[PDB]
Design a binder for these strands. Structure first.
Ligand SMILES: NC(=[NH2+])NCCC[C@H](N)C(=O)O
Ligand SMILES: [Mg+2]
Ligand SMILES: [Mg+2]
Ligand SMILES: [Mg+2]
Ligand SMILES: [Mg+2]
Ligand SMILES: [Mg+2]
Ligand SMILES: [Mg+2]
Ligand SMILES: [Mg+2]
Ligand SMILES: [Mg+2]
Ligand SMILES: [Mg+2]
Ligand SMILES: [Mg+2]
Ligand SMILES: [Mg+2]
Ligand SMILES: [Mg+2]
Ligand SMILES: [Mg+2]
Ligand SMILES: [Mg+2]
Ligand SMILES: [Mg+2]
Ligand SMILES: [Mg+2]
Ligand SMILES: [Mg+2]
Ligand SMILES: [Mg+2]
Ligand SMILES: [Mg+2]
Ligand SMILES: [Mg+2]
Ligand SMILES: [Mg+2]
Ligand SMILES: [Mg+2]
Ligand SMILES: [Mg+2]
Ligand SMILES: [Mg+2]
Ligand SMILES: [Mg+2]
Ligand SMILES: [Mg+2]
Ligand SMILES: [Mg+2]
Ligand SMILES: [Mg+2]
Ligand SMILES: [Mg+2]
Ligand SMILES: [Mg+2]
Ligand SMILES: [Mg+2]
Ligand SMILES: [Mg+2]
Ligand SMILES: [Mg+2]
Ligand SMILES: [Mg+2]
Ligand SMILES: [Mg+2]
Ligand SMILES: [Mg+2]
Ligand SMILES: [Mg+2]
Ligand SMILES: [Mg+2]
Ligand SMILES: [Mg+2]
Ligand SMILES: [Mg+2]
Ligand SMILES: [Mg+2]
Ligand SMILES: [Mg+2]
Ligand SMILES: [Mg+2]
Ligand SMILES: [Mg+2]
Ligand SMILES: [Mg+2]
Ligand SMILES: [Mg+2]
Ligand SMILES: [Mg+2]
Ligand SMILES: [Mg+2]
Ligand SMILES: [Mg+2]
Ligand SMILES: [Mg+2]
Ligand SMILES: [Mg+2]
Ligand SMILES: [Mg+2]
Ligand SMILES: [Mg+2]
Ligand SMILES: [Mg+2]
Ligand SMILES: [Mg+2]
Ligand SMILES: [Mg+2]
Ligand SMILES: [Mg+2]
Ligand SMILES: [Mg+2]
Ligand SMILES: [Mg+2]
Ligand SMILES: [Mg+2]
Ligand SMILES: [Mg+2]
Ligand SMILES: [Mg+2]
Ligand SMILES: [Mg+2]
Ligand SMILES: [Mg+2]
Ligand SMILES: [Mg+2]
Ligand SMILES: [Mg+2]
Ligand SMILES: [Mg+2]
Ligand SMILES: [Mg+2]
Ligand SMILES: [Mg+2]
Ligand SMILES: [Mg+2]
Ligand SMILES: [Mg+2]
Ligand SMILES: [Mg+2]
Ligand SMILES: [Mg+2]
Ligand SMILES: [Mg+2]
Ligand SMILES: [Mg+2]
Ligand SMILES: [Mg+2]
Ligand SMILES: [Mg+2]
Ligand SMILES: [Mg+2]
Ligand SMILES: [Mg+2]
Ligand SMILES: [Mg+2]
Ligand SMILES: [Mg+2]
Ligand SMILES: [Mg+2]
Ligand SMILES: [Mg+2]
Ligand SMILES: [Mg+2]
Ligand SMILES: [Mg+2]
Ligand SMILES: [Mg+2]
Ligand SMILES: [Mg+2]
Ligand SMILES: [Mg+2]
Ligand SMILES: [Mg+2]
Ligand SMILES: [Mg+2]
Ligand SMILES: [Mg+2]
Ligand SMILES: [Mg+2]
Ligand SMILES: [Mg+2]
Ligand SMILES: [Mg+2]
Ligand SMILES: [Mg+2]
Ligand SMILES: [Mg+2]
Ligand SMILES: [Mg+2]
Ligand SMILES: [Mg+2]
Ligand SMILES: [Mg+2]
Ligand SMILES: [Mg+2]
Ligand SMILES: [Mg+2]
Ligand SMILES: [Mg+2]
Ligand SMILES: [Mg+2]
Ligand SMILES: [Mg+2]
Ligand SMILES: [Mg+2]
Ligand SMILES: [Mg+2]
Ligand SMILES: [Mg+2]
Ligand SMILES: [Mg+2]
Ligand SMILES: [Mg+2]
Ligand SMILES: [Mg+2]
Ligand SMILES: [Mg+2]
Ligand SMILES: [Mg+2]
Ligand SMILES: [Mg+2]
Ligand SMILES: [Mg+2]
Ligand SMILES: [Mg+2]
Ligand SMILES: [Mg+2]
Ligand SMILES: [Mg+2]
Ligand SMILES: [Mg+2]
Ligand SMILES: [Mg+2]
Ligand SMILES: [Mg+2]
Ligand SMILES: [Mg+2]
Ligand SMILES: [Mg+2]
Ligand SMILES: [Mg+2]
Ligand SMILES: [Mg+2]
Ligand SMILES: [Mg+2]
Ligand SMILES: [Mg+2]
Ligand SMILES: [Mg+2]
Ligand SMILES: [Mg+2]
Ligand SMILES: [Mg+2]
Ligand SMILES: [Mg+2]
Ligand SMILES: [Mg+2]
Ligand SMILES: [Mg+2]
Ligand SMILES: [Mg+2]
Ligand SMILES: [Mg+2]
Ligand SMILES: [Mg+2]
Ligand SMILES: [Mg+2]
Ligand SMILES: [Mg+2]
Ligand SMILES: [Mg+2]
Ligand SMILES: [Mg+2]
Ligand SMILES: [Mg+2]
Ligand SMILES: [Mg+2]
Ligand SMILES: [Mg+2]
Ligand SMILES: [Mg+2]
Ligand SMILES: [Mg+2]
Ligand SMILES: [Mg+2]
Ligand SMILES: [Mg+2]
Ligand SMILES: [Mg+2]
Ligand SMILES: [Mg+2]
Ligand SMILES: [Mg+2]
Ligand SMILES: [Mg+2]
Ligand SMILES: [Mg+2]
Ligand SMILES: [Mg+2]
Ligand SMILES: [Mg+2]
Ligand SMILES: [Mg+2]
Ligand SMILES: [Mg+2]
Ligand SMILES: [Mg+2]
Ligand SMILES: [Mg+2]
Ligand SMILES: [Mg+2]
Ligand SMILES: [Mg+2]
Ligand SMILES: [Mg+2]
Ligand SMILES: [Mg+2]
Ligand SMILES: [Mg+2]
Ligand SMILES: [Mg+2]
Ligand SMILES: [Mg+2]
Ligand SMILES: [Mg+2]
Ligand SMILES: [Mg+2]
Ligand SMILES: [Mg+2]
Ligand SMILES: [Mg+2]
Ligand SMILES: [Mg+2]
Ligand SMILES: [Mg+2]
Ligand SMILES: [Mg+2]
Ligand SMILES: [Mg+2]
Ligand SMILES: [Mg+2]
Ligand SMILES: [Mg+2]
Ligand SMILES: [Mg+2]
Ligand SMILES: [Mg+2]
Ligand SMILES: [Mg+2]
Ligand SMILES: [Mg+2]
Ligand SMILES: [Mg+2]
Ligand SMILES: [Mg+2]
Ligand SMILES: [Mg+2]
Ligand SMILES: [Mg+2]
Ligand SMILES: [Mg+2]
Ligand SMILES: [Mg+2]
Ligand SMILES: [Mg+2]
Ligand SMILES: [Mg+2]
Ligand SMILES: [Mg+2]
Ligand SMILES: [Mg+2]
Ligand SMILES: [Mg+2]
Ligand SMILES: [Mg+2]
Ligand SMILES: [Mg+2]
Ligand SMILES: [Mg+2]
Ligand SMILES: [Mg+2]
Ligand SMILES: [Mg+2]
Ligand SMILES: [Mg+2]
Ligand SMILES: [Mg+2]
Ligand SMILES: [Mg+2]
Ligand SMILES: [Mg+2]
Lengths: 203, 77, 59, 141, 110
RNA sequence: UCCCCCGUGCCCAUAGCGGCGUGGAACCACCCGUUCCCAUUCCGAACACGGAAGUGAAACGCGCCAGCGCCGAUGGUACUGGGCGGGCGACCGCCUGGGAGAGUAGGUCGGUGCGGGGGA
RNA sequence: CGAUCAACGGAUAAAAGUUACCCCGGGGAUAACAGGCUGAUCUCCCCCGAGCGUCCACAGCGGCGGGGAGGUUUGGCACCUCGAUGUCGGCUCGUCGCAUCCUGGGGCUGAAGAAGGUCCCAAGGGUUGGGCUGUUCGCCCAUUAAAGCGGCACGCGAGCUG
RNA sequence: CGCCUCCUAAAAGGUAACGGAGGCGCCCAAAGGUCCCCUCAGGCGGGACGGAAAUCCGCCGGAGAGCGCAAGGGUAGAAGG
RNA sequence: CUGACUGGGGCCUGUAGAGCACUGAUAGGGCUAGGGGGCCCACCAGCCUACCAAACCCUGUCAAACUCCGAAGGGUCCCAGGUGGAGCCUGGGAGUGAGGGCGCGAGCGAUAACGUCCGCGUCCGAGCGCGGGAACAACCGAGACCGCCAGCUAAGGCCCCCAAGUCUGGGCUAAGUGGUAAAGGAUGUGGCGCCGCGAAGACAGCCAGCUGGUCGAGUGGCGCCGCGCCGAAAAUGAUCGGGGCUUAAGCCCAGCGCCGAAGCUGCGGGUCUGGG
């Protein structure tokens, strides 16, 4: 659907201090504005885990406003794997590029043969009107064999949405599964030493 | 156990010898270099090993002219 | 304004450039108080050795 | 097992293991991941042993993504020699691994199937690990 | 992606500015032939002369010689005496050569 | 001083590639010839000379389009001069001053100095 | 102009070996013995649970890999001792450790019984005589409740042997 | 064991180990001075013998070629032909 | 007056970090010359590939000798503060040219050594003078001219040995953890979350034959944080320095007071230098 999230303005307070208070710092911007903001970590998590960069988020500001935004970029703590910064993109009447979920409807024939569906793109980048945001986009993978694949070209689009990636871009494939029978022959494969790219009168 | 390595060459002590804003006399060496990292500019000649030397008394100036490279100038006093 | 700088922690074991700073400030003995004209040059040293000293603003 | 097919230079200085991961810190292929909690040189023998554990668990099915590669040559002087007489010989290759990196990912397998395979493989590794699943946080990277 | 014309033009001009003199540059079109003396130190033209501005006649060679003298006369009046001949992409020959020889006849120093 | 063109610099891709459009009065260009100067390791293709029937087709100049190229914040972060703590370590934190890179929003189909030729 | 004076700032124009027959001045600035530090190597104990065990991952075992302990092996280092720290093995005399060979006490067993396997507790005592070789070690004979493994400067030469 | 190039070298210079890697002990009478021209590798397409590659034609191609020999710096607005 | 150091300003740089545009490496996928393989052919090609895979493209990465980027810093010149056992010039006299620990940055070694070889700093050397660390050159504190039965502090401390708190307020720990160790294992304890399932009667069970029934309030998993438990075997007699300590005399957070050096102060004295 469409989710709501309370956001507060921030000034000279330290991002370090905010995060320790349980508040996840971020910024709000578009071609017109640019405001330093902070949300609550635990609240934002609740929203974002479903919303993501796919659904619109309305930001209830304390000045009384309510800006409808998309999350454009999230910054993770590479050590702790936690969010440390949020980019809220203030949406306006003009079209905007964004990522739109894909649903792979159907059970591939390769999957019946034991294969595995590798969902390369679990969403797709699309130029579209803000009023025109699809909940998802269906894809028929039922006709996929080991090892066949679909591309963004094979994506049948809803009205008003335009592809922002190369039609050549592969999006999903069905690949052979791990097998213990492969272990014996994989183990029997003897490896020759790494040759050296040389320097000088050899190179 | 032995090695075929172990060699190296005497350091050549290259680089800029006078920086911008520094007063130099006619003949003062300004840049020591391999090839033309810096190029001779106003009142500055170049030696057979790309050595940049002040042609006149004055003050050094550097200017970076993008795709044209970097240049060293001596401004007369 | 003037600065009243007081040496309160020994420079022993700290880099020679920090010992030089105290010399510029004129601080030679522990617990010694010196009053300095608050200029940028004087302030830089007083801040270089801020972990050895105690500054109070006066005048 | 995992080693470069060729290299410009045969031996490599040891370097350092300071800081959190450079990149590769988010799930990017499969459904579930195994992430390193502390830094190490993870040997090719370990990687392969950690892999085999998982495929053995799946028996048939699943897909294993190996997101680390041992390109760093490990050197060791012969037994009982003294210091000097040059650098040692290459005896194996390791992959430098700093805290936070997703080392392994599985896909196309039930949750309990992934939890166990990644745990078992976790035991073949010389470091502490953490099992993780794909988030929107991962999708946004 | 440069052309033999551009490179030829560049190569001979860089050589001229290096000597640091005032440069007598010469453009030579299909009908006309212009000439200006430039201070590349300041990026300023100091004295001009051309067939198009002198409304000159028939044979382009004989015309050039005239614009050459024209330039020199206007030149010395300004205190300019010595100068360097920028032959541009044009071989010192015929029309251009004639323009130069005219400037010389007029008392210009090069 | 304003407009267009021919020169010549500067800034050094926000100036580029691709696409489209437009200009020949003037200027430039291609163009017409190869007698003469001069020329082709062969070729008047190039360089060069003498010209002025044609055409702005190629070139070039001026516009327009963001598919690529190029520029690119704010915010956060890594790293760090200096001051401190923690771990047996690999390593990990704090204060203060400095603060990237990637990426995001977005910018861009140039700006400008001198001299001429033409126009208002 | 004559330099592989290439040991390339180039002792002479001109030069190799050997000493268990040896000597002097020096060094623990530097090796060999021991100790120390380290623990790669070694010995031992764990983690994981592929797989074996008719059946059954764990009675007994434990692929590929992972973490440690010890300080008995071979080493690395070169820190006290080179105005001396006597170096193997035996004999003698012991004393400690316990990761226990036996005896005592236990749980599990693929423990019918008897006898074994495996782990846990336990250092009180015990732990034989011979043949080979300098041997420690090891093989072998005949027995045994058992014929334990290590530390003590590989304990012990101002105690002996040699 | 002297000399040259790169790294180690901690963004001035310098910096060690029986640390990681290669080179030199020549050469050129043009491979030198100057003046005047010329611009590569590679890719696609086209062309008797002609081939992956001989020579020719076209389009694209900022330099990835070339510069006697190692490496680095440099370099077509030439130092290349 | 030029010095170390410092303030401003310009210029030089290619490390930390990061990046993949070059040189190489690289996982998977896509696309696609080459082979391999199969149906198919000798008559010259087809076609399919759950095969090995070039170039290219996408997602994700690695590099001392890779860099499209690129700091903090550092070097240098200028102006300014800086009068210091500062600096510059000529000359006389040396000694040293075995260093070592420690912190940070590297190589070597085994992400060993009271290891080794460089770099920047420091201390010991020469401060084996002083307080702290049980003891201990280089760890913390501090640069000892002499005297005092005076005062203030530094590190570290204040139950007794032993100078000063059995000091105050909040919390944890029951292991003497504190008072040496890892993978891994666990209904230890306290504390924050997160899912289920429950008076549409849950869970435990107590029954009749998984249903109900029976009672009448919770119950069952995940994960994170603090402090503890196991894993924990070595050789003369034991121990955290000892005694001894459990709402501590342990650990974490916050305070007030004291004790404590040859540091600082007070008083007196010496010597040299500078100035009256
Ligand atoms: N402000 C600074 N320069 N910080 C230094 C960063 C490195 C430091 N050792 C740390 O762990 O944080
Ligand atoms: Mg959270
Ligand atoms: Mg060998
Ligand atoms: Mg050798
Ligand atoms: Mg040198
Ligand atoms: Mg030399
Ligand atoms: Mg050297
Ligand atoms: Mg060098
Ligand atoms: Mg330089
Ligand atoms: Mg010269
Ligand atoms: Mg400037
Ligand atoms: Mg200048
Ligand atoms: Mg101190
Ligand atoms: Mg002092
Ligand atoms: Mg200290
Ligand atoms: Mg300092
Ligand atoms: Mg400094
Ligand atoms: Mg004092
Ligand atoms: Mg104070
Ligand atoms: Mg290793
Ligand atoms: Mg190594
Ligand atoms: Mg040896
Ligand atoms: Mg070595
Ligand atoms: Mg080695
Ligand atoms: Mg190995
Ligand atoms: Mg890593
Ligand atoms: Mg592990
Ligand atoms: Mg990315
Ligand atoms: Mg100008
Ligand atoms: Mg123009
Ligand atoms: Mg265009
Ligand atoms: Mg037209
Ligand atoms: Mg016309
Ligand atoms: Mg017309
Ligand atoms: Mg003729
Ligand atoms: Mg004629
Ligand atoms: Mg001729
Ligand atoms: Mg013609
Ligand atoms: Mg022409
Ligand atoms: Mg046209
Ligand atoms: Mg033209
Ligand atoms: Mg056009
Ligand atoms: Mg626009
Ligand atoms: Mg950017
Ligand atoms: Mg910023
Ligand atoms: Mg620091
Ligand atoms: Mg940090
Ligand atoms: Mg900071
Ligand atoms: Mg700051
Ligand atoms: Mg940026
Ligand atoms: Mg453009
Ligand atoms: Mg212009
Ligand atoms: Mg104008
Ligand atoms: Mg005009
Ligand atoms: Mg001779
Ligand atoms: Mg010699
Ligand atoms: Mg000799
Ligand atoms: Mg002699
Ligand atoms: Mg001689
Ligand atoms: Mg002789
Ligand atoms: Mg001889
Ligand atoms: Mg000799
Ligand atoms: Mg002898
Ligand atoms: Mg003899
Ligand atoms: Mg004899
Ligand atoms: Mg004999
Ligand atoms: Mg004798
Ligand atoms: Mg002797
Ligand atoms: Mg010694
Ligand atoms: Mg020696
Ligand atoms: Mg010796
Ligand atoms: Mg010895
Ligand atoms: Mg030895
Ligand atoms: Mg001994
Ligand atoms: Mg020894
Ligand atoms: Mg001893
Ligand atoms: Mg030891
Ligand atoms: Mg070991
Ligand atoms: Mg050990
Ligand atoms: Mg154990
Ligand atoms: Mg079985
Ligand atoms: Mg069983
Ligand atoms: Mg099984
Ligand atoms: Mg077992
Ligand atoms: Mg095994
Ligand atoms: Mg281990
Ligand atoms: Mg082991
Ligand atoms: Mg020992
Ligand atoms: Mg021993
Ligand atoms: Mg040894
Ligand atoms: Mg030993
Ligand atoms: Mg040795
Ligand atoms: Mg020794
Ligand atoms: Mg010795
Ligand atoms: Mg010794
Ligand atoms: Mg030594
Ligand atoms: Mg002695
Ligand atoms: Mg001795
Ligand atoms: Mg004696
Ligand atoms: Mg003695
Ligand atoms: Mg026992
Ligand atoms: Mg028994
Ligand atoms: Mg028993
Ligand atoms: Mg029985
Ligand atoms: Mg029985
Ligand atoms: Mg039993
Ligand atoms: Mg006993
Ligand atoms: Mg006993
Ligand atoms: Mg015994
Ligand atoms: Mg006998
Ligand atoms: Mg034997
Ligand atoms: Mg018996
Ligand atoms: Mg028995
Ligand atoms: Mg016996
Ligand atoms: Mg002995
Ligand atoms: Mg013994
Ligand atoms: Mg004796
Ligand atoms: Mg003996
Ligand atoms: Mg003895
Ligand atoms: Mg003995
Ligand atoms: Mg004795
Ligand atoms: Mg004898
Ligand atoms: Mg030599
Ligand atoms: Mg260097
Ligand atoms: Mg350097
Ligand atoms: Mg360097
Ligand atoms: Mg440096
Ligand atoms: Mg210098
Ligand atoms: Mg020639
Ligand atoms: Mg040459
Ligand atoms: Mg040449
Ligand atoms: Mg070609
Ligand atoms: Mg062809
Ligand atoms: Mg043919
Ligand atoms: Mg051909
Ligand atoms: Mg090149
Ligand atoms: Mg060669
Ligand atoms: Mg002064
Ligand atoms: Mg000065
Ligand atoms: Mg100065
Ligand atoms: Mg300064
Ligand atoms: Mg500066
Ligand atoms: Mg790096
Ligand atoms: Mg690359
Ligand atoms: Mg990318
Ligand atoms: Mg790195
Ligand atoms: Mg890297
Ligand atoms: Mg480097
Ligand atoms: Mg680098
Ligand atoms: Mg940039
Ligand atoms: Mg840029
Ligand atoms: Mg800077
Ligand atoms: Mg500086
Ligand atoms: Mg001054
Ligand atoms: Mg002095
Ligand atoms: Mg002095
Ligand atoms: Mg003297
Ligand atoms: Mg004397
Ligand atoms: Mg004397
Ligand atoms: Mg000496
Ligand atoms: Mg010496
Ligand atoms: Mg020495
Ligand atoms: Mg020494
Ligand atoms: Mg040394
Ligand atoms: Mg530290
Ligand atoms: Mg170090
Ligand atoms: Mg190394
Ligand atoms: Mg280890
Ligand atoms: Mg040492
Ligand atoms: Mg060390
Ligand atoms: Mg070390
Ligand atoms: Mg030192
Ligand atoms: Mg001494
Ligand atoms: Mg001391
Ligand atoms: Mg001292
Ligand atoms: Mg003490
Ligand atoms: Mg002491
Ligand atoms: Mg004490
Ligand atoms: Mg004492
Ligand atoms: Mg001590
Ligand atoms: Mg010590
Ligand atoms: Mg007091
Ligand atoms: Mg205190
Ligand atoms: Mg105490
Ligand atoms: Mg207290
Ligand atoms: Mg007592
Ligand atoms: Mg007391
Ligand atoms: Mg109390
Ligand atoms: Mg216990
Ligand atoms: Mg205790
Ligand atoms: Mg204890
Ligand atoms: Mg643990
Ligand atoms: Mg627990
Ligand atoms: Mg229960
Ligand atoms: Mg324990
Ligand atoms: Mg309390
Ligand atoms: Mg005193
Ligand atoms: Mg007094
Ligand atoms: Mg004095």
């Amino acid at each position: 659907m469409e989710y709501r999230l309370k956001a507060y303005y921030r000034e000279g307070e330290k991002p370090s201090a905010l995060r320790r208070a349980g508040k996840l710092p971020g910024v709000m911007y578009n071609r017109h504005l640019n405001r330093k903001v902070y949300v609550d970590l635990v609240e934002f998590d609740k929203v974002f885990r479903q919303a993501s960069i796919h659904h619109v988020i309305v930001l209830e500001l304390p000045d009384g406003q309510s800006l409808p935004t998309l999350v454009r970029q999230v910054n993770l703590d590479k050590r702790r794997r936690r969010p440390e910064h949020v980019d809220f993109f203030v949406l306006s009447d003009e079209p905007v590029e964004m990522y739109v979920p894909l649903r792979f409807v159907g059970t591939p024939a390769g999957v019946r043969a034991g294969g595995v569906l590798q969902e390369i793109h679990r969403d797709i980048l699309v130029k579209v009107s803000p009023r025109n945001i699809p909940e998802f986009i269906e894809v028929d993978v039922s006709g996929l064999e080991i090892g066949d694949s679909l591309h963004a070209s094979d994506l049948k689009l809803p009205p008003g949405v335009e592809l922002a990636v190369s039609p050549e871009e592969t999006i999903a494939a069905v690949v052979p599964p791990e097998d213990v029978e492969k272990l014996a022959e994989e183990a029997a494969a003897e490896v020759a030493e790494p040759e050296v790219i040389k320097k000088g009168k050899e190179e | 156990g032995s090695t075929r390595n172990g060699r190296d060459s005497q350091a050549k002590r290259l680089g800029v010898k006078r920086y911008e804003g520094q007063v130099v006399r006619a003949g003062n060496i300004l840049v020591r270099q391999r090839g033309t990292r810096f190029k001779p500019g106003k009142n500055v000649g170049m030696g057979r090993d790309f050595t940049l030397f002040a042609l006149v008394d004055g003050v050094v100036e550097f200017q970076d002219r993008g795709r044209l490279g970097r240049y060293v100038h001596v401004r007369p006093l | 304004p003037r600065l009243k700088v007081k040496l309160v922690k020994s420079p022993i074991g700290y880099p020679k450039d920090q010992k030089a700073a105290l010399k510029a400030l004129g601080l030679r003995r522990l617990q010694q108080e010196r009053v300095l004209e608050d200029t940028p040059a004087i302030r830089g040293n007083v801040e270089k050795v801020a972990h050895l000293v105690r500054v109070e603003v006066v005048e | 097992m995992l080693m470069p097919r060729r290299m410009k230079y045969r031996k490599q200085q040891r370097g350092r293991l300071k800081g959190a991961t450079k990149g590769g810190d988010y799930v990017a292929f499969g459904d579930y991941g195994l992430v390193a909690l502390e830094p190490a040189w993870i040997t090719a023998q370990q990687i392969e042993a950690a892999r085999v554990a998982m495929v053995r668990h799946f028996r048939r099915g699943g897909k294993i993504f190996i997101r680390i590669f041992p390109d760093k040559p490990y050197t060791k002087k012969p037994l009982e020699v003294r210091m000097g007489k040059g650098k040692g010989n290459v005896e194996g290759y390791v992959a430098v691994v700093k805290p936070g990196r997703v080392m392994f990912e599985v896909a196309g397998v039930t949750e309990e199937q992934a939890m166990e395979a990644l745990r078992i493989a976790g035991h073949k590794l010389p470091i502490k690990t953490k099992i993780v699943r794909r988030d929107a946080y991962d999708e946004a990277q | 992606r440069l052309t033999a014309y551009e490179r030829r033009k560049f190569r001979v001009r860089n050589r001229i500015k290096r000597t640091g003199r005032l440069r007598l540059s010469v453009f030579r079109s299909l009908k006309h032939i212009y000439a200006q003396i430039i201070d590349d130190e300041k990026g300023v033209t100091l004295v001009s002369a051309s067939s198009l501005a002198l409304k000159l006649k028939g044979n382009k060679t004989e015309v050039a010689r005239q614009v050459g003298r024209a330039l020199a006369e206007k030149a010395l009046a300004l205190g300019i005496k010595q100068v360097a001949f920028d032959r541009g992409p044009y071989k010192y020959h015929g029309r251009v050569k004639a323009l130069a020889e005219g400037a010389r006849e007029g008392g210009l120093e090069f």
